[PDB]
Write a protein that binds this ligand. Structure first.
Ligand SMILES: [Zn+2]
Lengths: 89, 118, 121, 278, 195, 73, 147, 73, 124
DNA sequence: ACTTGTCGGTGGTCTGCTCTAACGTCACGGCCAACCGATCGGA
C-alpha cells in the first residue's frame, strides 16, 4: 500500500521532456528545475504566468548615470566632425 | 624483552568497518580483522578451495547484506546463504565511470544489468 | 479570561491528585469545583494531554477502580504552580495581615503563616 | 575614455532610432557603426594595455589558498569594472581607480573561493580583525593573549571569540600519509558509524517475534488497539480520534481500553520475557 | 579538484558573457583545461597540484594505480571477519592434525556459535542475555565452548605465504595460555621458528 | 524510535532521554588497578584547547608475570 | 545487482556526452559542500540532496515528508526524493563545460593516440590544445585557385 | 652562535629604493617559563622568551628608531 | 481540537524539554498547532498563546538554542516553576478558614480562590 | 464573549551587492640527486 500520487510532464526549451512524481494535495509548479539543469515549463494550455525579471545594470546605464545627455551629445558631435574631416577633407 | 603475548593476542568475529569500501578495519587498537592478501589467495587457488576463498572475499569482507544474513543464520542455526556482490567492485565501477569510461555489465541476452539494487 | 482559570485549575489538580494518595471522588468533587458533573469531563480531557508523540506511556494515567482517583503517570507534572507576583499572593497576604479581629490564632499560627508565606514568595 | 563614451552613446542612439525611429541616412548609419566599433576597440586596447597592473597587485596575495592565476583573473574582472567606472574629467590617472577596483575584486574573490566550507565575507573580515588584534596583543603583552584581552580590545563578548576561532578550522585531508612509508592513510582509521552491527538486527527480529507472541495472549480488540496506537502494524502510529473513528467509539473509550491493556501488560507474566530486551 | 573545475568554469562563463578580450578568455580556457587534466590525472602534464604541506593532491588515476591502488589493495586481497592473530609456541604432545588455540581467542572467534548453543541449553533466556554472559566471561560459557569447537577445523597461516603449505587446517583444542601451540613437524612447511 | 522500543519503554516506564552514552571504558583484553586521576577544567583556569570544557586522565597499573609466549633474550 | 552467475560479460568503451548526461541525476553549479552554520548540504553544490539523494532515510530536505508511506515521491518544495540514504553512493552528477576539454589520457600518453589519429606530433598537439598556436581547420582551395 | 650567525646574515634588510633599512641584533634569553616537571604535568613546552633588538633607519631623513622586539618562546 | 488541550500540551512539552525548542519544531510536534491554514495564522496564534502563558505566571523564557546555534527557542524553568516546600498545617487551616468571607470584587475572590487551590495542590 | 485568521507595523540579525580617485604596471621558493629495462621522438 502506497500513497496515491500524480505524474507531471515538463518540457525544457531545447525539446527535452521529463516526468516528476508529485503528491495529490500539492500545488504542482508551472516551472521546474529539470534534470539537465535547465528550467522547464509544464505542458498546459492555461499557463500559470510566472514572475518576470528585468535585466540588471549594464554599461550604458552607468554611463548615463555618471554623464548627462548634453556632454555625450557634444562628444559625439566632436567625434563625428573629426571623422568627417578625416574622410572627406 | 618488550614482546609480550598480552599485547599480541587479538581476535574478532564482527566489529567496525570502513566507509568508502565496506571492509573491516585493521589493528588491535581498533578491533580490526586480519588481511587475506594476494599470496593467501594464490595458496587457496592452488589448493583448489573455491568455496572457502569465495566466502572469505564476499561474506566476511564486503557483502553488506551477506554479513548480517550469515550472522542471523549462524545464530538461528540454518545454512549459510549464498554470497552476493562485493561492494568494492561497485566502487571500482563508479570510479571507472567517473573517468568517462563506459563500463557496463552484460547479461547472456546482451542487455545491461543495473547495479542499483535496493 | 475564562479559559485561564480552567488551565490553572488543571495544572493544580494534577499535582493535587499525585500528592493525595487515593483521594476519593467526593473529596475532589467538593474541593476543586463543587460541580462534580464536570469533574468527569475534566478528567476525560486530562486523559488526552501528555508528552510529545502522544502515545501510551506519554499521556497522563489514572486508576478509576472505584471512587479513588490515583495517577500512575504524570508526564512531568508533579509540582503545583507558583503563586504569581502580587495578585493572588498580594491579596492573600493583605487579608491575612489586615484582619480586624482580636487575636485568636496570633500566638503561633497567624504570625507563623505570615512569615512562612513571605519567605516562600 | 572619450572614444569609449562616444561609441556607447552612438550605439544607444542607433538602437533608439532602430525601433520607433526613422530611416537613417546611409552615411549616418556607417558613421554610427564606425564609432561603435572604434569604441569597442578602444575599450579592448585600454584593457589590454592595463593588464600588467593586475599582476603586480596579485603578486602580494600569493600563498593564501588561491592560486596565482586565479588571483590574476579576478583582478582582470576588477580591471574591467574599473574601466567601466572610469571618469576622465577628474584628471586623475587610471592607476588609482584601477588599483582600488582590482584590490577589491581580488580580496572579495579570495574571501569567497578559498575555503572548502564557505564562510561569508562579513565573518571573514571579523576573523581577520580578530587575528590582527591578537597579533598586536601578543606584541604588546609579551605573552600569548587570553580571550579576556581580545574581548576588551575587540568590543565583543568573551564568548563570540570562541565561536569565531571555531569557525576558522580547515578540514584535514583523508588522503594524508600517517606512517613514514607510503602504505597508510588517515581514511583507513575512520570507522563507519552508520553500518549495521549485524547483532542488533537479529536481536530486533527476535524482539519482534517475542512481542508478537506476548500480544497474542490478549483478545482481538486490545491487541488491535495496541497495534494501531503504537504503530506496530506496518510503519507508523495513529491518534486517539483516528482510531476511535475507525472503530466507531469515543476517544474516552479508546483511552480506557489502552489504560487497561497497559495495566495488564505490566503484569510480570507478560514482562519477564521482555525485560532482557531493554 | 571539483571545486577548482567549477570555479574556473563559472569564471569562464562570466568572462564570455561580459565580452572580455580574447587574451583573458584564452587564459581562462587554458586554466579550465589544466584543471580538468589535474582532476583526471594530477601530474602527467606540468607540475602536480599540491595542498597544505606541499603534498600533491590525489586524483582518480591515483585511486586506480599502484600497490596501494583500488585493484591490488581492495580487490585481490581484503580484510576478513572471524580472524585472529597470536604468537606461536611449540606443543610436542599434539598430533599432526591438532593445534592449541587460546581460550579467549577461540571464544571471540566462536561467539556467534556459543551464543546459540548456550541459549539452547537454557543458560540464557534470549540472545541478549547470552551476549552479556559471553562478554562477562561467565563460568558456564567455557563448557559450552568445548562443545562448539569440536570437529570444527581452523585455518592457520604465517606470512609470507610462499607455497600452498603456508595455509593449513588444524583441529583446535582449548589451551590456558595466550599463545598458539603449533606442532613441531609442520614448521618446515610454514618456515616458522619459535623466536 | 522504533515502535517496538517505544512500546517496551512504555511497558517498563524507562523514559527515553535525548542523550547518548559515550563513557570511557577499558579496552578489550586490558585490566589492572586505578592508581591516579588527573582532572582539568576550564572553569578553574586551565589552558585547555578551544572547544574543550573538561578533561580527565586515568592511570591503570598492572603487574605482569612471566608466561608462555613472552620473549626472553 | 544479484546472481553473480548471471554476469556474462564486462564491456568497456569511450563515454560520449550523451552517456555522461544520461548517467547524471542533475548538474552541479556551485563549488559548495556544506553550510558553515547548520552543517547541512547546500543546494546545487557538491553534496546537494536534490541531485545525489537524502542524507537521512525517508526524509526530504525541508522535513515536510518524514515517513515510509511517502515512498517514491518527490517533495514539491525542496525537490528531494523520499528514499533510502544509501542512494548517495549510486547517483552521479555532471558539469556542463563552457568550452570543450580534451581527455588527458588520450593526449598525454605514450604513444599519443590523438597524435596517431590526426597525424600530428605531440608537440603540435600541446601547442594547439593549450592555446599556443593556431591550426587551419579547413581551407577553401577551390576559391583560392580561381582568384 | 647560530642565532647570532643568522641575525648577522640577515641584519641589513634594505628595500629596492635604498631609503629604508631594518636591522636585528643582540639576541637575549630570559628565565625559563616553567620547570620540567610542571611542563610535563600541565602539558606545556619547556621554552624561554627570546628578545632581539631591532633598529629602523630611514636613509633620506637620517632618523633612526630602536626597540626591543619579542621573538617568541 | 481544543484551545485548552493546546495550552496544556504546550505547557507539558516546554516543561519536559532539555534545550530551547524552536517555534518551527513546536508547530510540527505540539498537537493542535498543525491545523492552521498558513504560517501567519499559526504565528499569531502562538504569539497570543505565549502572551497568555506569560501573563498567567508560568515562567516562559526565550533564548538561544545553544552556543553554536543561531536558532532561538523557548523553555520553561522547572526550578522557577514553583516552590515545593510548605510550612505547618495548623496555621494553614486558619488561613484557609479566613481566606474569603464577604469580598465581592471579582478579581479579589478569583485571586483568593486561585491561592487556595494552589495551597491545596501543595498540601491541604 | 471568546476565538481566530487576514492585515499592518517596529525592531533586530544574518547575508549579499556596490563603492572608495596622488601615484602605483611583465610570479616564485625550491629540488633534483636510485637504478634497472623498454621505447618513442630526434640527429
Ligand atoms: Zn521537502
Amino acid at each position: 500500500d502506497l500513497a496515491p500520487r500524480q505524474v507531471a510532464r515538463y518540457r525544457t526549451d531545447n525539446g527535452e521532456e521529463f516526468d516528476v512524481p508529485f503528491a495529490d494535495d500539492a500545488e504542482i509548479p508551472g516551472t521546474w528545475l529539470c534534470r539537465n539543469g535547465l528550467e522547464g515549463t509544464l505542458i498546459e494550455g492555461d499557463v500559470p504566468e510566472p514572475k518576470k525579471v528585468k535585466p540588471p545594470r549594464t554599461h550604458w546605464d552607468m554611463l548615463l548615470e555618471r554623464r548627462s545627455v548634453e556632454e555625450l551629445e557634444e562628444l559625439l558631435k566632436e567625434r563625428l566632425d573629426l571623422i568627417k574631416a578625416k574622410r572627406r577633407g | 624483552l618488550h614482546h609480550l603475548v598480552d599485547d599480541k593476542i587479538h581476535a574478532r568475529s564482527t566489529g567496525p568497518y570502513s566507509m568508502i569500501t565496506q571492509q573491516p578495519l585493521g589493528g588491535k587498537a581498533q578491533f580490526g580483522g586480519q588481511r587475506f592478501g594476494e599470496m593467501e589467495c594464490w595458496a587457496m587457488q592452488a589448493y583448489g578451495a573455491a568455496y572457502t576463498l569465495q566466502e572469505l572475499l564476499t561474506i566476511k569482507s564486503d557483502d553488506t547484506v551477506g554479513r548480517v544474513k550469515v550472522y542471523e543464520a549462524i545464530v538461528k542455526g540454518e545454512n549459510i546463504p549464498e554470497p552476493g556482490i562485493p561492494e568494492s567492485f561497485k566502487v571500482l565501477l563508479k570510479e571507472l565511470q567517473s573517468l568517462c569510461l563506459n563500463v557496463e555489465v552484460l547479461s547472456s541476452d546482451g542487455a545491461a544489468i543495473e547495479m542499483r539494487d535496493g | 479570561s475564562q479559559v485561564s482559570t480552567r488551565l490553572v485549575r488543571l495544572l493544580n489538580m494534577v499535582p493535587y491528585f499525585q500528592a493525595n494518595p487515593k483521594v476519593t471522588r467526593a473529596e475532589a468533587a467538593a474541593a476543586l469545583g463543587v460541580t462534580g458533573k464536570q469533574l468527569d469531563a475534566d478528567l476525560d480531557q486530562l486523559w488526552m494531554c501528555g508528552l510529545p508523540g502522544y502515545s501510551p506511556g506519554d499521556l497522563i494515567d489514572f486508576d478509576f477502580v472505584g471512587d479513588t482517583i490515583e495517577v500512575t503517570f504524570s508526564a512531568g507534572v508533579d509540582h503545583p504552580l507558583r503563586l504569581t507576583s502580587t495578585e493572588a499572593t498580594g491579596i492573600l497576604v493583605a487579608l491575612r495581615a489586615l484582619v480586624d479581629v482580636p487575636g485568636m490564632v496570633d500566638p503561633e499560627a497567624a504570625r507563623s503563616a505570615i512569615a512562612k508565606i513571605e519567605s516562600a514568595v | 575614455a572619450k572614444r569609449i563614451e562616444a561609441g556607447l552613446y552612438a550605439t544607444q542612439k542607433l538602437a533608439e532610432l532602430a525601433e520607433k525611429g526613422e530611416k537613417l541616412p546611409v552615411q549616418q548609419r556607417r558613421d554610427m557603426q564606425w564609432i561603435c566599433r572604434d569604441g569597442d576597440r578602444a575599450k579592448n586596447h585600454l584593457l589590454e594595455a592595463n593588464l600588467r597592473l593586475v599582476v603586480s597587485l596579485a603578486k602580494r596575495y600569493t600563498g593564501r589558498g588561491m592560486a596565482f592565476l586565479d588571483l590574476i583573473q579576478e583582478g582582470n574582472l576588477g580591471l574591467i569594472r574599473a574601466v567601466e567606472k572610469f571618469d576622465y574629467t577628474k584628471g586623475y590617472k587610471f592607476s588609482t581607480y584601477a588599483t582600488w577596483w582590482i584590490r577589491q575584486a581580488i580580496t572579495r574573490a579570495m574571501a569567497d573561493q578559498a575555503r572548502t566550507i564557505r564562510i561569508p565575507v562579513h565573518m571573514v573580515e571579523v576573523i581577520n580583525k580578530l587575528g590582527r588584534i591578537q597579533r598586536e596583543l601578543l606584541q604588546d603583552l609579551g605573552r600569548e593573549p587570553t580571550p579576556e584581552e581580545l574581548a576588551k580590545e575587540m568590543d565583543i563578548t568573551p564568548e563570540k571569540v570562541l565561536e569565531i576561532q571555531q569557525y576558522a578550522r580547515e578540514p584535514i585531508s583523508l588522503d594524508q600519509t600517517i606512517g613514514d612509508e607510503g602504505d597508510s592513510q588517515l581514511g583507513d582509521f575512520i570507522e563507519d558509524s552508520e553500518a549495521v552491527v549485524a547483532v542488533d538486527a537479529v536481536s530486533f527480529t527476535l524482539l519482534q517475534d517475542q512481542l508478537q507472541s506476548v500480544l497474542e495472549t490478549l483478545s482481538e480488540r486490545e491487541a488491535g488497539v495496541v497495534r494501531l496506537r503504537f504503530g506496530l502494524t506496518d510503519g507508523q502510529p495513529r491518534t486517539l480520534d483516528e482510531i476511535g473513528q475507525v472503530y466507531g467509539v469515543t476517544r474516552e473509550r479508546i483511552r480506557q481500553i489502552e489504560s487497561k491493556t497497559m495495566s495488564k501488560l505490566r503484569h510480570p507474566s507478560r514482562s519477564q520475557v521482555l525485560r532482557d530486551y531493554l | 579538484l571539483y571545486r577548482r573545475v567549477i570555479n574556473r568554469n563559472n569564471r569562464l562563463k562570466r568572462l564570455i558573457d561580459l565580452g572580455a578580450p580574447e587574451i583573458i578568455v584564452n587564459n581562462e580556457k587554458r586554466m579550465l583545461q589544466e584543471s580538468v587534466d589535474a582532476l583526471f590525472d594530477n601530474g602527467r602534464r606540468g607540475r602536480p597540484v599540491t595542498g597544505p604541506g606541499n603534498r600533491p593532491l590525489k586524483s582518480l588515476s591515483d585511486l586506480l594505480k599502484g600497490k596501494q591502488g583500488r585493484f591490488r589493495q581492495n580487490l585481490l586481497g581484503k580484510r576478513v571477519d572471524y580472524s585472529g592473530r597470536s604468537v606461536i609456541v611449540v606443543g610436542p604432545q599434539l598430533k599432526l592434525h591438532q593445534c592449541g588455540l587460546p581460550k579467549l581467542m577461540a571464544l571471540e572467534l566462536f561467539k556467534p556459535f556459543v551464543m546459540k548453543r548456550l541459549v539452547d541449553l537454557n543458560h540464557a533466556q534470549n540472545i541478549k542475555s547470552a551476549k552479556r554472559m559471553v562478554e562477562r566471561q561467565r563460568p558456564q560459557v567455557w563448557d559450552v565452548l568445548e562443545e562448539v569447537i569440536a570437529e570444527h577445523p581452523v585455518l592457520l597461516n604465517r606470512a609470507p605465504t610462499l607455497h600452498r603449505l603456508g595455509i593449513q587446517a588444524f583441529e583446535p583444542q582449548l589451551v590456558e595460555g595466550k599463545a598458539i601451540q603449533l606442532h613441531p613437524l609442520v614448521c618446515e612447511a610454514f618456515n616458522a621458528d619459535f623466536d | 524510535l522504533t515502535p517496538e522500543e517505544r512500546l517496551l519503554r512504555a511497558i517498563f516506564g524507562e523514559k527515553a532521554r535525548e542523550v547518548r552514552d559515550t563513557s570511557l571504558k577499558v579496552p578489550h583484553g586490558e585490566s589492572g588497578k586505578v592508581i591516579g586521576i588527573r582532572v582539568f577544567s576550564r572553569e578553574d583556569d586551565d589552558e585547555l584547547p578551544a572547544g574543550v570544557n573538561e578533561l580527565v586522565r586515568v592511570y591503570v597499573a598492572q603487574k605482569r608475570k612471566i608466561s608462555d609466549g613472552d620473549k626472553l633474550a | 545487482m544479484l546472481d553473480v552467475n548471471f554476469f556474462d560479460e564486462l564491456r568497456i568503451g569511450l563515454a560520449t556526452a550523451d552517456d555522461i548526461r544520461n548517467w547524471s541525476y542533475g548538474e552541479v553549479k556551485k563549488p559548495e559542500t556544506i553550510n558553515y552554520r547548520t552543517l547541512k548540504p547546500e543546494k546545487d553544490g557538491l553534496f546537494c540532496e536534490k541531485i545525489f539523494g537524502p542524507t537521512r532515510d525517508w526524509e526530504c530536505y525541508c522535513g515536510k515528508y518524514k515517513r515510509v508511506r511517502f515512498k517514491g515521491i518527490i517533495c514539491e518544495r525542496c525537490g528531494v526524493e523520499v528514499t533510502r540514504a544509501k542512494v548517495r553512493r549510486e547517483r552521479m552528477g555532471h558539469i556542463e563545460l563552457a568550452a570543450p576539454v580534451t581527455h588527458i589520457w588520450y593526449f598525454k600518453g605514450v604513444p599519443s593516440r590523438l597524435g596517431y589519429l590526426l597525424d600530428l606530433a605531440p608537440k603540435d598537439l600541446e601547442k594547439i590544445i593549450y592555446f599556443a598556436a593556431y591550426v587551419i581547420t579547413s581551407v577553401d582551395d577551390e576559391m583560392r585557385h580561381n582568384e | 652562535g647560530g642565532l647570532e650567525e643568522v641575525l648577522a646574515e640577515l641584519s641589513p634588510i634594505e628595500d629596492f629604493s635604498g631609503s629604508m633599512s631594518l636591522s636585528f641584533s643582540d639576541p637575549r634569553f630570559d628565565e625559563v617559563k616553567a620547570s620540567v616537571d610542571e611542563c610535563k604535568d600541565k602539558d606545556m613546552t619547556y621554552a624561554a622568551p627570546l628578545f632581539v633588538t631591532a633598529e629602523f633607519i630611514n636613509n633620506n631623513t637620517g632618523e633612526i628608531k630602536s626597540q626591543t622586539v619579542f621573538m617568541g618562546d | 481540537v481544543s484551545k485548552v488541550e493546546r495550552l496544556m500540551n504546550l505547557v507539558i512539552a516546554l516543561l519536559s524539554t532539555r534545550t530551547y525548542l524552536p517555534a518551527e519544531k513546536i508547530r510540527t510536534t505540539v498537537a493542535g498547532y498543525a491545523d492552521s491554514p498558513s504560517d501567519e495564522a499559526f504565528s499569531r496564534m502562538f504569539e497570543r498563546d505565549k502572551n497568555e502563558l506569560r501573563d498567567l505566571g508560568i515562567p516562559l523564557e526565550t533564548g538561544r538554542v545553544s552556543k553554536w546555534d543561531s536558532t532561538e527557542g523557548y523553555r520553561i524553568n522547572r526550578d522557577s516553576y514553583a516552590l515545593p516546600p510548605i510550612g505547618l498545617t495548623a496555621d494553614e487551616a486558619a488561613a484557609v478558614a479566613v481566606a474569603t468571607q464577604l469580598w465581592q470584587s471579582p478579581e479579589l475572590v478569583t485571586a483568593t480562590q486561585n491561592a487556595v487551590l494552589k495551597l491545596r495542590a501543595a498540601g491541604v
